[PDB]
């Protein structure tokens, strides 16, 4: 297995988006590409990463592979990567260690790290795949700011989505706060549009802490996509520009 990525920074971001929520995960590597999936310790959230093999500037996978990785360690190694570095992932072929290779953009500095893998027993693979009552698309930074802000007010957030707009309400010992986002309609906005796809109105409650973890994927994508239905987990989706996605599922309150 060998995958080369010119925009190494992507990878860095990916791990910054995972290392705090999940410390261990298994990496499924196949001809189709790389899939990761792992719930956090408390079983309240789930992380699902998909990077299609077509997204890498080079990709070669001979066998289905399942490598146990400590995301903290790998984060440490990616911290030694430069932002414009070309990063290659090399698998030995047996189940031993995972190599990370950082090429400085001008070829005269080359780093090679060889990370010890873990033997984890993989499972499950399946959140149940719904058709949602509400789908809200917004800027990622805006979402991050909203979670951050309302965490000042309360520990939980009530998302109330209707056709016109979406509302984010929090309540605590300070008082309460509402953040209302109206849908951008015929007004020309693209990346920074707020577009709401609603079948039925929803009003769900979620733990703000987990969301404030999810927003660490903000650098990966200029938009975030929230999929909601009642009494089922929320989907917070970040597109990994052109090569895939990173989605977080969150059990409701």
């Amino acid at each position: 297995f060998e995958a080369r990525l010119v925009q190494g920074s992507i990878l860095k971001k990916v791990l910054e988006a995972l290392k705090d929520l999940i410390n261990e995960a298994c990496w499924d590597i196949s001809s189709s590409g790389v899939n990761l999936q792992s719930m956090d310790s408390s079983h309240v959230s789930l992380v699902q990463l998909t990077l299609r093999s077509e997204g890498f500037d080079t990709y070669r996978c001979d066998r289905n592979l399942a490598m146990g990785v400590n995301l903290t360690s790998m984060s440490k190694i990616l911290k030694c990567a430069g932002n414009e570095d070309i990063i290659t992932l090399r698998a030995e072929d047996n189940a031993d260690t995972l190599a990370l290779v950082f090429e400085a953009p001008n070829q005269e500095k080359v780093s090679d790290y060889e990370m010890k893998l873990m033997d984890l027993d993989v499972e499950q693979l399946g959140i149940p795949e719904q058709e949602y009552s509400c789908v809200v698309k917004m800027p990622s930074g805006e979402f991050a700011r909203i979670c951050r802000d309302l965490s000042h007010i309360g520990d939980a957030v009530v998302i109330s989505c209707a056709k016109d707009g979406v509302k984010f309400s929090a309540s605590g010992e300070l008082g309460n706060g509402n953040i209302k986002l109206s849908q951008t309609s015929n007004v020309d906005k693209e990346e920074e549009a707020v577009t709401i796809e609603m079948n039925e109105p929803v009003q769900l409650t979620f733990a703000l802490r987990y969301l404030n973890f999810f927003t660490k994927a903000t650098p990966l994508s200029s938009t975030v996509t929230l999929s909601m239905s009642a009494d089922v987990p929320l989907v917070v989706e970040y597109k990994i520009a052109d090569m895939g996605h990173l989605k977080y599922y969150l059990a409701p309150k």
Binding site: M39, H43, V44, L46, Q124, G126, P128, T205, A251, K253
Partner: peptide, 12 residues
Amino acid sequence: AFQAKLDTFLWS
């Protein structure tokens, strides 16, 4: 209210 775990929604 109730903080559910994802195990109930996972497909086994």
